[PDB]
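Forum: Protein Structure Q&A
Topic: Joint prediction for protein chains with partners

I've read a bunch of threads here and the consensus seems to be that you should model interacting components together rather than docking separate models afterwards. I'd like to see that in practice. Below is the full input, 560 residues plus whatever partners are listed. Could one of the regulars post the assembled result?
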Amino acid sequence: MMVWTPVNNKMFETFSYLPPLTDEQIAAQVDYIVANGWIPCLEFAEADKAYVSNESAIRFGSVSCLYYDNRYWTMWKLPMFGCRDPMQVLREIVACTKAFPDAYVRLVAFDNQKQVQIMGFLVQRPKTARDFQPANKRSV
Amino acid sequence: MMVWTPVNNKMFETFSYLPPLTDEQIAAQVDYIVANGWIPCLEFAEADKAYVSNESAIRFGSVSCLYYDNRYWTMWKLPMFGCRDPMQVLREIVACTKAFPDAYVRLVAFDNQKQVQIMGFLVQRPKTARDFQPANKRSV
Amino acid sequence: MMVWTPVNNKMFETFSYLPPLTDEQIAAQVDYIVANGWIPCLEFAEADKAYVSNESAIRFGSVSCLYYDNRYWTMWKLPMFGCRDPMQVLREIVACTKAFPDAYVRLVAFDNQKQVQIMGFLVQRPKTARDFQPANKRSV
Amino acid sequence: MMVWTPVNNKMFETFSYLPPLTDEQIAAQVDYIVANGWIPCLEFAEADKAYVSNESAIRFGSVSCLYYDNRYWTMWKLPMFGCRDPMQVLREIVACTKAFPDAYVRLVAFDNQKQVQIMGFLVQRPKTARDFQPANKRSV
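Posted by a regular:
Agreed with the consensus. Here's the joint model:
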Protein backbone atom coordinates (compact mmCIF):
# COMPACT_ATOMS: atom_id res chain seq x y z
CA MET A 1 0.00 0.00 0.00
CA MET A 2 1.29 3.43 -0.97
CA VAL A 3 0.06 6.56 0.79
CA TRP A 4 -1.02 9.63 -1.21
CA THR A 5 0.81 12.60 0.31
CA PRO A 6 -1.23 15.53 1.67
CA VAL A 7 1.90 17.74 1.92
CA ASN A 8 2.91 20.11 -0.89
CA ASN A 9 0.90 18.10 -3.41
CA LYS A 10 -1.21 20.83 -5.04
CA MET A 11 -2.71 20.09 -8.44
CA PHE A 12 -3.82 22.15 -11.45
CA GLU A 13 -6.98 20.64 -12.94
CA THR A 14 -6.88 18.96 -16.37
CA PHE A 15 -3.74 16.83 -17.04
CA SER A 16 -2.07 17.62 -13.72
CA TYR A 17 -2.24 13.91 -12.68
CA LEU A 18 -0.23 12.86 -15.74
CA PRO A 19 3.52 13.22 -16.39
CA PRO A 20 4.36 16.84 -17.26
CA LEU A 21 3.58 17.61 -20.90
CA THR A 22 6.52 17.48 -23.31
CA ASP A 23 6.73 20.09 -26.07
CA GLU A 24 5.44 17.45 -28.52
CA GLN A 25 2.46 16.77 -26.22
CA ILE A 26 1.64 20.47 -25.92
CA ALA A 27 1.88 20.83 -29.71
CA ALA A 28 -0.54 17.90 -30.07
CA GLN A 29 -3.07 19.64 -27.76
CA VAL A 30 -2.73 22.80 -29.89
CA ASP A 31 -3.38 20.71 -33.04
CA TYR A 32 -6.54 19.46 -31.34
CA ILE A 33 -7.70 23.04 -30.67
CA VAL A 34 -7.13 24.00 -34.31
CA ALA A 35 -8.67 20.82 -35.77
CA ASN A 36 -11.87 21.60 -33.85
CA GLY A 37 -11.98 25.32 -34.75
CA TRP A 38 -11.81 26.47 -31.13
CA ILE A 39 -10.41 29.85 -30.02
CA PRO A 40 -7.03 29.63 -28.24
CA CYS A 41 -6.18 32.00 -25.40
CA LEU A 42 -3.48 32.34 -22.79
CA GLU A 43 -4.03 33.34 -19.15
CA PHE A 44 -1.56 34.05 -16.35
CA ALA A 45 -1.38 34.78 -12.62
CA GLU A 46 1.25 35.60 -10.02
CA ALA A 47 1.71 32.85 -7.38
CA ASP A 48 -0.52 34.59 -4.79
CA LYS A 49 -3.40 34.75 -7.33
CA ALA A 50 -3.09 31.21 -8.69
CA TYR A 51 -5.26 29.03 -6.45
CA VAL A 52 -8.88 29.41 -5.40
CA SER A 53 -9.40 31.37 -2.17
CA ASN A 54 -12.10 32.87 0.10
CA GLU A 55 -10.86 36.31 1.21
CA SER A 56 -13.64 38.45 -0.37
CA ALA A 57 -16.32 36.49 1.56
CA ILE A 58 -15.52 38.62 4.62
CA ARG A 59 -17.74 41.25 2.91
CA PHE A 60 -20.65 38.86 2.39
CA GLY A 61 -23.91 37.92 4.01
CA SER A 62 -24.85 34.23 3.53
CA VAL A 63 -24.09 34.24 -0.21
CA SER A 64 -20.72 32.51 -0.55
CA CYS A 65 -22.07 29.37 -2.34
CA LEU A 66 -19.97 28.93 -5.50
CA TYR A 67 -18.04 32.14 -4.94
CA TYR A 68 -14.23 31.84 -4.96
CA ASP A 69 -11.50 34.41 -5.58
CA ASN A 70 -8.71 33.59 -8.09
CA ARG A 71 -10.85 31.72 -10.64
CA TYR A 72 -10.26 34.60 -13.04
CA TRP A 73 -6.67 34.93 -14.19
CA THR A 74 -5.30 37.69 -16.43
CA MET A 75 -5.74 37.51 -20.19
CA TRP A 76 -2.62 37.48 -22.34
CA LYS A 77 -3.52 39.91 -25.15
CA LEU A 78 -6.81 38.70 -26.70
CA PRO A 79 -8.30 35.31 -27.60
CA MET A 80 -6.88 34.30 -30.96
CA PHE A 81 -10.05 34.62 -33.04
CA GLY A 82 -9.79 33.07 -36.50
CA CYS A 83 -6.45 31.44 -35.72
CA ARG A 84 -5.93 28.22 -37.70
CA ASP A 85 -2.11 28.04 -37.36
CA PRO A 86 -0.75 25.98 -34.43
CA MET A 87 2.68 27.63 -34.75
CA GLN A 88 1.12 31.02 -33.98
CA VAL A 89 -0.26 29.60 -30.70
CA LEU A 90 3.09 28.08 -29.73
CA ARG A 91 4.76 31.43 -30.49
CA GLU A 92 2.36 33.20 -28.08
CA ILE A 93 3.13 30.66 -25.34
CA VAL A 94 6.81 31.56 -25.76
CA ALA A 95 6.03 35.30 -25.74
CA CYS A 96 3.73 35.10 -22.68
CA THR A 97 6.11 32.98 -20.60
CA LYS A 98 9.01 35.28 -21.57
CA ALA A 99 7.14 38.43 -20.44
CA PHE A 100 6.02 36.73 -17.22
CA PRO A 101 8.75 34.17 -16.31
CA ASP A 102 7.66 33.94 -12.65
CA ALA A 103 3.91 33.58 -13.33
CA TYR A 104 1.66 30.57 -13.65
CA VAL A 105 0.53 30.39 -17.27
CA ARG A 106 -2.28 28.23 -18.65
CA LEU A 107 -3.43 27.62 -22.21
CA VAL A 108 -7.20 27.58 -22.76
CA ALA A 109 -9.60 27.36 -25.72
CA PHE A 110 -13.17 28.62 -26.15
CA ASP A 111 -16.17 27.27 -28.04
CA ASN A 112 -18.35 30.21 -29.15
CA GLN A 113 -21.41 28.02 -29.95
CA LYS A 114 -21.67 26.56 -26.44
CA GLN A 115 -20.03 29.79 -25.19
CA VAL A 116 -17.77 27.99 -22.74
CA GLN A 117 -14.10 27.15 -22.26
CA ILE A 118 -13.70 23.74 -23.88
CA MET A 119 -10.09 22.93 -22.87
CA GLY A 120 -7.34 24.13 -20.54
CA PHE A 121 -4.08 23.11 -18.91
CA LEU A 122 -1.05 24.63 -17.23
CA VAL A 123 1.97 25.36 -19.45
CA GLN A 124 4.17 27.14 -16.89
CA ARG A 125 4.64 27.25 -13.15
CA PRO A 126 7.22 29.55 -11.48
CA LYS A 127 10.57 27.86 -10.70
CA THR A 128 10.16 29.04 -7.08
CA ALA A 129 7.01 26.91 -6.54
CA ARG A 130 7.49 24.38 -3.70
CA ASP A 131 3.84 23.30 -3.20
CA PHE A 132 3.72 20.42 -5.73
CA GLN A 133 5.26 16.92 -6.02
CA PRO A 134 6.94 15.30 -9.00
CA ALA A 135 4.87 12.32 -10.26
CA ASN A 136 7.00 9.67 -8.51
CA LYS A 137 6.78 11.48 -5.13
CA ARG A 138 2.96 11.82 -5.01
CA SER A 139 2.68 8.66 -2.96
CA VAL A 140 5.02 7.16 -0.36
CA MET B 1 2.27 28.58 44.43
CA MET B 2 3.34 27.66 40.94
CA VAL B 3 1.95 29.42 37.87
CA TRP B 4 0.73 27.39 34.88
CA THR B 5 2.36 28.91 31.78
CA PRO B 6 0.13 30.26 28.98
CA VAL B 7 3.09 30.59 26.58
CA ASN B 8 4.04 27.80 24.17
CA ASN B 9 2.18 25.23 26.26
CA LYS B 10 -0.01 23.56 23.64
CA MET B 11 -1.44 20.14 24.47
CA PHE B 12 -2.59 17.13 22.46
CA GLU B 13 -5.62 15.55 24.13
CA THR B 14 -5.37 12.13 25.81
CA PHE B 15 -2.12 11.51 27.77
CA SER B 16 -0.56 14.89 26.91
CA TYR B 17 -0.51 15.88 30.62
CA LEU B 18 1.60 12.84 31.53
CA PRO B 19 5.34 12.31 30.97
CA PRO B 20 5.96 11.44 27.29
CA LEU B 21 5.20 7.77 26.59
CA THR B 22 8.17 5.41 26.53
CA ASP B 23 8.30 2.68 23.88
CA GLU B 24 7.25 0.21 26.60
CA GLN B 25 4.26 2.42 27.47
CA ILE B 26 3.24 2.75 23.81
CA ALA B 27 3.50 -1.05 23.43
CA ALA B 28 1.25 -1.43 26.50
CA GLN B 29 -1.42 0.81 24.90
CA VAL B 30 -1.21 -1.27 21.69
CA ASP B 31 -1.69 -4.46 23.77
CA TYR B 32 -4.84 -2.83 25.21
CA ILE B 33 -6.19 -2.15 21.69
CA VAL B 34 -5.58 -5.76 20.66
CA ALA B 35 -6.87 -7.28 23.92
CA ASN B 36 -10.18 -5.47 23.34
CA GLY B 37 -10.50 -6.29 19.64
CA TRP B 38 -10.45 -2.66 18.51
CA ILE B 39 -9.25 -1.49 15.09
CA PRO B 40 -5.88 0.32 15.12
CA CYS B 41 -5.25 3.17 12.70
CA LEU B 42 -2.62 5.86 12.23
CA GLU B 43 -3.30 9.47 11.26
CA PHE B 44 -0.90 12.31 10.47
CA ALA B 45 -0.84 16.05 9.69
CA GLU B 46 1.68 18.71 8.78
CA ALA B 47 2.25 21.35 11.50
CA ASP B 48 -0.12 23.91 9.88
CA LYS B 49 -2.96 21.34 9.90
CA ALA B 50 -2.39 19.95 13.41
CA TYR B 51 -4.50 22.18 15.70
CA VAL B 52 -8.16 23.14 15.53
CA SER B 53 -8.82 26.37 13.61
CA ASN B 54 -11.66 28.57 12.28
CA GLU B 55 -10.65 29.68 8.77
CA SER B 56 -13.54 28.08 6.80
CA ALA B 57 -16.12 29.94 8.91
CA ILE B 58 -15.47 33.02 6.75
CA ARG B 59 -17.81 31.28 4.26
CA PHE B 60 -20.59 30.69 6.81
CA GLY B 61 -23.81 32.29 7.93
CA SER B 62 -24.51 31.78 11.67
CA VAL B 63 -23.71 28.05 11.62
CA SER B 64 -20.22 27.74 13.12
CA CYS B 65 -21.39 25.92 16.31
CA LEU B 66 -19.18 22.83 16.69
CA TYR B 67 -17.48 23.40 13.35
CA TYR B 68 -13.66 23.47 13.41
CA ASP B 69 -11.05 22.91 10.72
CA ASN B 70 -8.17 20.42 11.36
CA ARG B 71 -10.16 17.86 13.34
CA TYR B 72 -9.68 15.49 10.40
CA TRP B 73 -6.10 14.38 9.87
CA THR B 74 -4.84 12.21 7.00
CA MET B 75 -5.19 8.43 7.21
CA TRP B 76 -2.01 6.35 7.03
CA LYS B 77 -3.01 3.50 4.66
CA LEU B 78 -6.21 1.88 6.04
CA PRO B 79 -7.48 0.96 9.50
CA MET B 80 -5.94 -2.38 10.42
CA PHE B 81 -9.10 -4.52 10.30
CA GLY B 82 -8.70 -8.01 11.78
CA CYS B 83 -5.27 -7.13 13.23
CA ARG B 84 -4.52 -9.12 16.35
CA ASP B 85 -0.72 -8.72 16.35
CA PRO B 86 0.68 -5.75 18.38
CA MET B 87 4.04 -5.98 16.54
CA GLN B 88 2.27 -5.23 13.24
CA VAL B 89 0.91 -1.97 14.72
CA LEU B 90 4.34 -1.00 16.07
CA ARG B 91 5.86 -1.67 12.63
CA GLU B 92 3.30 0.66 11.01
CA ILE B 93 4.13 3.42 13.51
CA VAL B 94 7.78 3.08 12.41
CA ALA B 95 6.78 3.09 8.71
CA CYS B 96 4.44 6.09 9.03
CA THR B 97 6.89 8.24 11.02
CA LYS B 98 9.69 7.30 8.58
CA ALA B 99 7.66 8.43 5.55
CA PHE B 100 6.56 11.64 7.33
CA PRO B 101 9.40 12.58 9.76
CA ASP B 102 8.22 16.21 10.06
CA ALA B 103 4.53 15.44 10.63
CA TYR B 104 2.42 15.06 13.73
CA VAL B 105 1.40 11.41 13.95
CA ARG B 106 -1.26 9.94 16.24
CA LEU B 107 -2.32 6.38 16.97
CA VAL B 108 -6.07 5.81 17.19
CA ALA B 109 -8.39 2.81 17.55
CA PHE B 110 -12.01 2.27 16.47
CA ASP B 111 -14.87 0.32 17.99
CA ASN B 112 -17.22 -0.80 15.18
CA GLN B 113 -20.12 -1.67 17.53
CA LYS B 114 -20.34 1.82 19.04
CA GLN B 115 -18.94 3.15 15.73
CA VAL B 116 -16.60 5.63 17.39
CA GLN B 117 -12.92 6.18 18.04
CA ILE B 118 -12.27 4.55 21.40
CA MET B 119 -8.66 5.60 22.01
CA GLY B 120 -6.02 7.96 20.66
CA PHE B 121 -2.74 9.67 21.52
CA LEU B 122 0.16 11.44 19.81
CA VAL B 123 3.15 9.26 18.88
CA GLN B 124 5.23 11.87 17.00
CA ARG B 125 5.60 15.62 16.87
CA PRO B 126 8.00 17.37 14.46
CA LYS B 127 11.44 18.16 15.97
CA THR B 128 10.94 21.79 14.85
CA ALA B 129 7.91 22.28 17.16
CA ARG B 130 8.56 25.04 19.74
CA ASP B 131 5.02 25.49 21.08
CA PHE B 132 5.05 22.95 23.94
CA GLN B 133 6.59 22.66 27.41
CA PRO B 134 8.46 19.95 29.28
CA ALA B 135 6.27 18.47 32.04
CA ASN B 136 8.41 20.26 34.70
CA LYS B 137 8.22 23.59 32.84
CA ARG B 138 4.43 23.61 32.60
CA SER B 139 4.37 25.72 35.77
CA VAL B 140 6.83 28.45 36.80
CA MET C 1 -0.44 44.36 -28.84
CA MET C 2 0.97 45.27 -25.43
CA VAL C 3 -0.25 43.57 -22.24
CA TRP C 4 -1.10 45.63 -19.15
CA THR C 5 0.66 44.03 -16.18
CA PRO C 6 -1.41 42.81 -13.20
CA VAL C 7 1.73 42.29 -11.07
CA ASN C 8 3.01 45.02 -8.73
CA ASN C 9 1.12 47.71 -10.63
CA LYS C 10 -0.84 49.44 -7.86
CA MET C 11 -2.16 52.94 -8.54
CA PHE C 12 -2.96 55.99 -6.46
CA GLU C 13 -6.04 57.70 -7.92
CA THR C 14 -5.75 61.10 -9.66
CA PHE C 15 -2.60 61.58 -11.80
CA SER C 16 -1.18 58.08 -11.14
CA TYR C 17 -1.48 57.16 -14.86
CA LEU C 18 0.71 60.09 -15.93
CA PRO C 19 4.52 60.45 -15.65
CA PRO C 20 5.52 61.31 -12.06
CA LEU C 21 4.94 64.99 -11.29
CA THR C 22 8.02 67.22 -11.47
CA ASP C 23 8.51 69.90 -8.81
CA GLU C 24 7.34 72.43 -11.41
CA GLN C 25 4.19 70.38 -12.08
CA ILE C 26 3.50 70.04 -8.34
CA ALA C 27 3.96 73.82 -7.98
CA ALA C 28 1.46 74.35 -10.82
CA GLN C 29 -1.16 72.21 -9.00
CA VAL C 30 -0.56 74.21 -5.80
CA ASP C 31 -1.11 77.41 -7.84
CA TYR C 32 -4.42 75.97 -9.01
CA ILE C 33 -5.56 75.34 -5.41
CA VAL C 34 -4.61 78.91 -4.41
CA ALA C 35 -6.10 80.52 -7.54
CA ASN C 36 -9.43 78.88 -6.72
CA GLY C 37 -9.41 79.73 -3.00
CA TRP C 38 -9.44 76.07 -1.91
CA ILE C 39 -8.04 74.81 1.40
CA PRO C 40 -4.78 72.84 1.07
CA CYS C 41 -4.12 69.92 3.42
CA LEU C 42 -1.57 67.14 3.72
CA GLU C 43 -2.35 63.54 4.73
CA PHE C 44 -0.07 60.58 5.36
CA ALA C 45 -0.15 56.84 6.12
CA GLU C 46 2.32 54.07 6.83
CA ALA C 47 2.51 51.43 4.06
CA ASP C 48 0.16 48.97 5.82
CA LYS C 49 -2.55 51.68 6.06
CA ALA C 50 -2.17 53.04 2.52
CA TYR C 51 -4.57 50.97 0.41
CA VAL C 52 -8.25 50.17 0.85
CA SER C 53 -8.91 46.98 2.83
CA ASN C 54 -11.71 44.92 4.41
CA GLU C 55 -10.47 43.76 7.82
CA SER C 56 -13.11 45.49 10.00
CA ALA C 57 -15.97 43.76 8.14
CA ILE C 58 -15.27 40.64 10.24
CA ARG C 59 -17.29 42.51 12.89
CA PHE C 60 -20.26 43.20 10.61
CA GLY C 61 -23.63 41.76 9.70
CA SER C 62 -24.58 42.32 6.03
CA VAL C 63 -23.62 46.00 6.01
CA SER C 64 -20.26 46.17 4.23
CA CYS C 65 -21.61 48.04 1.14
CA LEU C 66 -19.28 51.02 0.57
CA TYR C 67 -17.34 50.37 3.76
CA TYR C 68 -13.54 50.12 3.42
CA ASP C 69 -10.73 50.56 5.89
CA ASN C 70 -7.77 52.87 5.03
CA ARG C 71 -9.80 55.53 3.22
CA TYR C 72 -8.94 57.88 6.09
CA TRP C 73 -5.28 58.84 6.34
CA THR C 74 -3.68 60.89 9.13
CA MET C 75 -3.89 64.69 8.93
CA TRP C 76 -0.61 66.64 8.85
CA LYS C 77 -1.23 69.50 11.29
CA LEU C 78 -4.46 71.25 10.20
CA PRO C 79 -5.96 72.25 6.84
CA MET C 80 -4.35 75.50 5.75
CA PHE C 81 -7.37 77.80 6.14
CA GLY C 82 -6.87 81.25 4.63
CA CYS C 83 -3.66 80.20 2.85
CA ARG C 84 -2.88 82.59 -0.01
CA ASP C 85 0.74 81.59 -0.54
CA PRO C 86 1.77 78.58 -2.68
CA MET C 87 5.26 78.57 -1.12
CA GLN C 88 3.73 77.92 2.32
CA VAL C 89 2.13 74.74 0.95
CA LEU C 90 5.41 73.63 -0.68
CA ARG C 91 7.21 74.22 2.63
CA GLU C 92 4.72 71.98 4.49
CA ILE C 93 5.20 69.19 1.92
CA VAL C 94 8.94 69.38 2.73
CA ALA C 95 8.20 69.41 6.50
CA CYS C 96 5.72 66.51 6.37
CA THR C 97 7.90 64.27 4.19
CA LYS C 98 10.90 65.08 6.39
CA ALA C 99 9.08 64.02 9.57
CA PHE C 100 7.70 60.87 7.88
CA PRO C 101 10.25 59.81 5.18
CA ASP C 102 8.83 56.25 4.98
CA ALA C 103 5.16 57.23 4.73
CA TYR C 104 2.81 57.69 1.83
CA VAL C 105 1.97 61.40 1.71
CA ARG C 106 -0.75 63.01 -0.38
CA LEU C 107 -1.69 66.62 -1.05
CA VAL C 108 -5.41 67.35 -0.93
CA ALA C 109 -7.60 70.49 -1.13
CA PHE C 110 -11.08 71.20 0.24
CA ASP C 111 -13.98 73.29 -1.04
CA ASN C 112 -16.03 74.48 1.95
CA GLN C 113 -19.05 75.54 -0.17
CA LYS C 114 -19.55 72.06 -1.66
CA GLN C 115 -17.99 70.65 1.53
CA VAL C 116 -15.92 68.08 -0.32
CA GLN C 117 -12.32 67.36 -1.23
CA ILE C 118 -11.84 68.96 -4.64
CA MET C 119 -8.35 67.75 -5.55
CA GLY C 120 -5.72 65.27 -4.47
CA PHE C 121 -2.64 63.37 -5.58
CA LEU C 122 0.28 61.46 -4.09
CA VAL C 123 3.45 63.47 -3.35
CA GLN C 124 5.53 60.77 -1.64
CA ARG C 125 5.74 57.01 -1.55
CA PRO C 126 8.23 55.13 0.64
CA LYS C 127 11.49 54.22 -1.14
CA THR C 128 10.96 50.59 -0.08
CA ALA C 129 7.69 50.29 -2.09
CA ARG C 130 7.80 47.59 -4.77
CA ASP C 131 4.09 47.24 -5.58
CA PHE C 132 4.07 49.89 -8.35
CA GLN C 133 5.46 50.23 -11.91
CA PRO C 134 7.02 53.21 -13.69
CA ALA C 135 5.02 54.29 -16.76
CA ASN C 136 7.29 52.45 -19.25
CA LYS C 137 6.96 49.12 -17.44
CA ARG C 138 3.18 49.15 -17.10
CA SER C 139 2.72 47.13 -20.29
CA VAL C 140 4.85 44.33 -21.76
CA MET D 1 2.17 73.00 15.63
CA MET D 2 3.33 69.52 16.54
CA VAL D 3 1.88 66.43 14.82
CA TRP D 4 0.82 63.44 16.96
CA THR D 5 2.41 60.36 15.40
CA PRO D 6 0.15 57.52 14.16
CA VAL D 7 3.10 55.15 13.66
CA ASN D 8 4.26 52.74 16.38
CA ASN D 9 2.58 54.87 19.04
CA LYS D 10 0.53 52.23 20.85
CA MET D 11 -0.69 53.08 24.33
CA PHE D 12 -1.59 51.06 27.43
CA GLU D 13 -4.55 52.67 29.20
CA THR D 14 -4.13 54.38 32.60
CA PHE D 15 -0.88 56.38 33.03
CA SER D 16 0.50 55.54 29.55
CA TYR D 17 0.39 59.23 28.53
CA LEU D 18 2.67 60.23 31.43
CA PRO D 19 6.45 59.73 31.73
CA PRO D 20 7.25 56.09 32.59
CA LEU D 21 6.65 55.38 36.28
CA THR D 22 9.78 55.38 38.44
CA ASP D 23 10.17 52.74 41.16
CA GLU D 24 9.17 55.45 43.67
CA GLN D 25 6.02 56.24 41.65
CA ILE D 26 5.07 52.54 41.44
CA ALA D 27 5.61 52.18 45.21
CA ALA D 28 3.33 55.21 45.70
CA GLN D 29 0.56 53.56 43.65
CA VAL D 30 0.93 50.39 45.75
CA ASP D 31 0.59 52.48 48.95
CA TYR D 32 -2.64 53.85 47.46
CA ILE D 33 -3.99 50.30 46.93
CA VAL D 34 -3.13 49.28 50.49
CA ALA D 35 -4.37 52.55 52.04
CA ASN D 36 -7.79 51.93 50.47
CA GLY D 37 -7.99 48.20 51.33
CA TRP D 38 -8.16 47.05 47.71
CA ILE D 39 -6.97 43.65 46.47
CA PRO D 40 -3.71 43.69 44.48
CA CYS D 41 -3.23 41.30 41.58
CA LEU D 42 -0.79 40.86 38.72
CA GLU D 43 -1.69 39.87 35.16
CA PHE D 44 0.52 39.12 32.16
CA ALA D 45 0.43 38.31 28.43
CA GLU D 46 2.76 37.43 25.59
CA ALA D 47 3.13 40.13 22.93
CA ASP D 48 0.61 38.46 20.57
CA LYS D 49 -2.06 38.46 23.30
CA ALA D 50 -1.45 41.98 24.66
CA TYR D 51 -3.75 44.24 22.58
CA VAL D 52 -7.46 43.98 21.84
CA SER D 53 -8.27 42.07 18.63
CA ASN D 54 -11.22 40.65 16.64
CA GLU D 55 -10.21 37.18 15.44
CA SER D 56 -12.97 35.14 17.18
CA ALA D 57 -15.71 37.21 15.53
CA ILE D 58 -15.21 35.07 12.40
CA ARG D 59 -17.40 32.55 14.32
CA PHE D 60 -20.21 35.05 15.08
CA GLY D 61 -23.52 36.15 13.66
CA SER D 62 -24.24 39.87 14.23
CA VAL D 63 -23.21 39.84 17.91
CA SER D 64 -19.73 41.38 17.95
CA CYS D 65 -20.85 44.53 19.87
CA LEU D 66 -18.46 45.00 22.82
CA TYR D 67 -16.73 41.69 22.07
CA TYR D 68 -12.92 41.79 21.80
CA ASP D 69 -10.22 39.14 22.24
CA ASN D 70 -7.19 39.87 24.53
CA ARG D 71 -9.06 41.83 27.20
CA TYR D 72 -8.41 38.90 29.53
CA TRP D 73 -4.77 38.39 30.43
CA THR D 74 -3.32 35.55 32.53
CA MET D 75 -3.40 35.76 36.33
CA TRP D 76 -0.09 35.66 38.18
CA LYS D 77 -0.90 33.31 41.09
CA LEU D 78 -4.01 34.62 42.89
CA PRO D 79 -5.28 38.07 43.94
CA MET D 80 -3.52 38.98 47.18
CA PHE D 81 -6.52 38.81 49.51
CA GLY D 82 -5.91 40.31 52.95
CA CYS D 83 -2.61 41.86 51.80
CA ARG D 84 -1.79 44.95 53.85
CA ASP D 85 1.95 45.04 53.12
CA PRO D 86 3.17 47.09 50.09
CA MET D 87 6.57 45.34 50.09
CA GLN D 88 4.84 41.99 49.49
CA VAL D 89 3.20 43.45 46.34
CA LEU D 90 6.53 44.83 45.14
CA ARG D 91 8.15 41.42 45.73
CA GLU D 92 5.49 39.74 43.55
CA ILE D 93 6.09 42.25 40.74
CA VAL D 94 9.76 41.21 40.85
CA ALA D 95 8.86 37.48 40.93
CA CYS D 96 6.31 37.79 38.08
CA THR D 97 8.57 39.80 35.74
CA LYS D 98 11.46 37.42 36.52
CA ALA D 99 9.40 34.35 35.53
CA PHE D 100 8.08 36.08 32.37
CA PRO D 101 10.81 38.55 31.24
CA ASP D 102 9.42 38.79 27.71
CA ALA D 103 5.79 39.34 28.71
CA TYR D 104 3.64 42.41 29.20
CA VAL D 105 2.85 42.65 32.92
CA ARG D 106 0.25 44.88 34.56
CA LEU D 107 -0.56 45.64 38.18
CA VAL D 108 -4.29 45.79 38.93
CA ALA D 109 -6.44 46.09 42.07
CA PHE D 110 -9.97 44.92 42.86
CA ASP D 111 -12.70 46.38 45.04
CA ASN D 112 -14.95 43.55 46.27
CA GLN D 113 -17.84 45.87 47.31
CA LYS D 114 -18.28 47.38 43.84
CA GLN D 115 -16.92 44.09 42.47
CA VAL D 116 -14.79 45.79 39.85
CA GLN D 117 -11.16 46.48 39.04
CA ILE D 118 -10.46 49.87 40.64
CA MET D 119 -6.92 50.53 39.36
CA GLY D 120 -4.41 49.23 36.81
CA PHE D 121 -1.27 50.14 34.89
CA LEU D 122 1.55 48.50 32.95
CA VAL D 123 4.69 47.61 34.93
CA GLN D 124 6.59 45.72 32.21
CA ARG D 125 6.74 45.56 28.44
CA PRO D 126 9.05 43.19 26.50
CA LYS D 127 12.42 44.73 25.53
CA THR D 128 11.70 43.55 21.96
CA ALA D 129 8.62 45.82 21.65
CA ARG D 130 8.93 48.29 18.76
CA ASP D 131 5.29 49.50 18.57
CA PHE D 132 5.56 52.34 21.12
CA GLN D 133 7.20 55.80 21.27
CA PRO D 134 9.10 57.39 24.19
CA ALA D 135 7.30 60.49 25.54
CA ASN D 136 9.57 62.89 23.61
CA LYS D 137 8.86 61.14 20.27
CA ARG D 138 5.03 60.93 20.52
CA SER D 139 4.70 64.18 18.55
CA VAL D 140 6.89 65.48 15.69
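The longest strand of chain A covers residues 116-124.
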